[PDB]
């Protein structure tokens, strides 16, 4: 039914920048809101960013001012950009979709494959 | 990360005996239920017999008639079911599946439904006169 | 578990007079050198209030279940702390929320929930350490609970209990007393003590006291000398004199005397010589009368209803 | 606990700090229905009910009004008119056990669905088979509960999720549970517009030598105007005075004579507005 694909994961240079895309399918991308989350191995899941259907974006404080999220309505694809990514951001990022329509707040009903990023030098 | 192989299907005249094997490898569930579900053209898939990993207990349906016997072997991690006095109305495809067991009241209870957590492609058996 | 206490002779109820008593601060507003007229639920001046004794002399162990109409003034003249607690509610039979205030030995417990109250819930102190506590048998679904700091006739306690706008209000005051009986005259305002957001209906209340024990449990006890007075509050207007300290020193009932009502209208305690239009007089009707004309000419309903050729 | 028997917690006689509760890293889902998730602190409610349990990551979707499925139909049903926040966070780190966790159970089959806010303590062995099952476990007679079986190796959304559903209920009493209600620093000797514990106004605040009684907060003078207020934090009494208002009057010797004027500001000690007092 609902399928989520994420591209852009890999190794990160000190101070490098990465772009992640999540091309959803099987449902209405414009109405539903997208979200991104990270999971460090050995620790629980931790959301990193969120976006609403009205263009609003939410960012977690530990990564506030360094994470960028937006929408591509032409292609219905959500993008996550990490600028000045810190070496302590070694986690697996997941693309999530809203489980419903009504209600206000973050809604992570579905999860994607997830892209693993680790620091190498 | 689990792979299942089902063997023992074929076409044969009524009266013969058959054995069905469902090998399981790479399974991570400590306790699981394995059952056989029959499906035929013009017919709905339904279970016939099931086995339990905790103690080897078995469940029999109307199709068993006290004839089908299931003996899971840890030697090969394969479930073997024997069929005696196959009937023409029994022509169907047998499927094996893995379901997570239930622990309640200090005991392992096994539940089988229309939907299995894991599924595999079984074999079709034809009993033609 | 609680057991009914026998050996109690019935005596007629006794009444005494409240000599300018039961006045409290109605709000949290400071007022200095002003005469303020406030309309609220008060205890009328020079009103007669029910008196309950506790004396060995029968034994006068009277703890009725008194009505709680709109508010209750509860005074207690004691020297050895006989009475301690209160039980409030509507049914008091585990069918509705019931309030419980207890001060047995160390703290004060305020709990709202259903209890299986019996006919004679009491406390007992052996002879001095508290030993017995027989008030309720169960406490199932409790909403509010509170505790205060631990601790361990000549004393006059005054309380006012009120319940309005979903809030339960307690006012209190303590005063030295050196006099035998009958609620000595004077004035003392009651400062607010607690305002609990309980939001339940309390229409019937009881009282709790500790008895003294030194024969059988249902026969051997000492009530201990104490006196507690109960009065009710109804809506009246009062005229309160605030000191420059900010305290209430005098009050005028505005409805007991012609002179009191004149003072309350003039907004002054001292009134000079003259004639003052104080209020209005209306003789209210005591019956309702309707005199519609004679009734006749009813409809031929029988033709419509019977319709023999239906 | 597991979803088949969900605890029903009640919180009272304290203040809910939902700001820091929101901006929490672990909580993946903070969906609030009927209310503003941020602005709920200003909102005041009487009793809060917490409906806490652990479910599968793909089932967190099912906790919503008017949703069908398994958890909604058989385990835990929110009402159509549900108001409150459903909070869900992954707890794969502590609840999953190596080899599979069998201590978390959910109702798989049942004779009838569930009305909103209902719990099913009873777990007698199910009977669907038209033959009288006579208290036997087997085919057509399976045990209603089934175990999640969490492994740390399982899928990205199969892991356990701890979910607490807060429903806000108002009784026949004014709201008693509120939010932080933050304050600002206090300034004297310059007229500001103020909100002291719900008392709103505008004036210059000064130290007051009048002594209040401990219980009373503010004070009126004659004609029912606040003249002093007690600071909720430091418990000190502040006198209130309305800052200068007045009339301006223009003193003119006549346009025929000259256009030079004087201005009189009335009742204003105008070291604050040649100048002559
Ligand atoms: C037709 O309808 C009239 C309705 O008034 C019937 O009157 C009954 O009259 C007797 C005589 O007192 C009353 O006790 C009954 O109560 C009346 N009926 C009802 C329903 O109240 C009359 O009986 C009916 N039938 C005939 C014979 O015309
Ligand atoms: C006390 O007497 C009342 C009289 O109705 C009775 O209902 C109650 O059970 C008695 N309680 C005890 C403890 O004897
Ligand atoms: C009030 O109580 C007193 C005290 O017994 C009694 O004498 C009097 O008759 C009662 N009624 C009035 C109106 O005073
Ligand atoms: C407390 O009262 C509520 C409402 O009447 C009721 O549902 C609940 O069962 C009561 N508590 C107990 C332990 O019975
Ligand atoms: C109090 O009585 C009113 C009048 O019927 C009722 O509406 C309300 O629910 C009652 N409250 C309690 C706590 O019993
Ligand atoms: C407060 O009352 C006391 C005693 O009645 C008095 O001595 C004192 O002067 C009063 N306070 C002021 C500010 O006058
Ligand atoms: C009504 O009729 C009665 C006849 O019984 C008569 O006596 C009476 O005067 C009449 N009343 C009026 C107001 O007409
Ligand atoms: C908190 O309030 C109390 C009064 O309730 C006050 O004494 C205390 O100073 C306040 N806290 C701080 C840090 O000032
Ligand atoms: C007033 O105006 C008239 C007309 O311009 C002029 O003749 C006269 O001198 C003026 N008087 C004064 C006092 O300015
Ligand atoms: C105006 O304010 C000054 C500044 O303190 C003061 O000295 C003066 O007396 C004030 N004038 C009045 C109060 O009339």
Author numbering:
A (entry chain G): 1 to 82, 82A, 82B, 82C, 83 to 100, 100A, 100B, 100C, ...
B (entry chain F): 1 to 52, 52A, 53 to 82, 82A, 82B, 82C, 83 to 100, 100A, ...
C (entry chain C): 14 to 70, 76 to 145, 152 to 176, 186 to 247, 252 to 347
D (entry chain B): 348 to 620, 641 to 644
From the paper:
The SARS-CoV-2 spike protein binds the cellular receptor ACE2 and catalyzes membrane fusion. Conformational flexibility of the trimeric spike protein allows each of its receptor binding domains (RBDs) to exist in two major configurations: a “down” conformation that is thought to be less accessible to binding of most neutralizing antibodies (NAbs) and an “up” conformation that binds ACE2 and most NAbs to the RBD. Structures show that the nanobodies target two distinct epitopes on the SARS-CoV-2 spike protein.
On the basis of a superimposition of complex structures VHH E and VHH V binding to the same RBD, we determined that the C terminus of VHH V and the N terminus of VHH E were close enough (33 Å) to allow fusion with a 15–amino acid–long (GGGGS)3 linker (VHH VE). (E and F) Cryo-EM reconstruction (E) and atomic models (F) of VHH VE in complex with trimeric SARS-CoV-2 spike. The biparatopic VHH binds to SARS-CoV-2 in the 3-up conformation; the resolution is 2.62 Å (0.143 FSC). With apparent dissociation constants of 84 pM (VE) and 200 pM (EV), the binding strength of the biparatopic nanobodies to the RBD was, respectively, 22 and 9 times that of the best monoparatopic VHH (VHH E). In neutralization assays with SARS-CoV-2 S–pseudotyped VSV, we found that VE or EV neutralized with IC50 values of 4.1 or 2.9 nM—i.e., 12 or 18 times more effective than the neutralizing activity of VHH E alone—respectively. Neutralizing activity of VHH fusions, as measured by PRNTs with wild-type (WT) SARS-CoV-2, was improved even more, attaining IC50 values of 0.7 nM for EV and 1.32 nM for VE. VHHs EV and VE caused extensive cell-cell fusion, clearly exceeding the fusogenic activity of the individual nanobodies alone. Moreover, the enhanced fusogenic activity of EV and VE correlates with the improved neutralizing activity over VHH E, which could not be explained by ACE2 competition. No virus resistant to biparatopic VHHs EV and VE emerged during two rounds of selection. Simultaneous binding of VHH VE to the E and UVW interfaces may involve additional conformational changes not revealed on the unprocessed spike used for EM, possibly facilitating proteolytic processing of S2 to S2′, or bona fide dissociation of S1 from the SARS-CoV-2 spike.
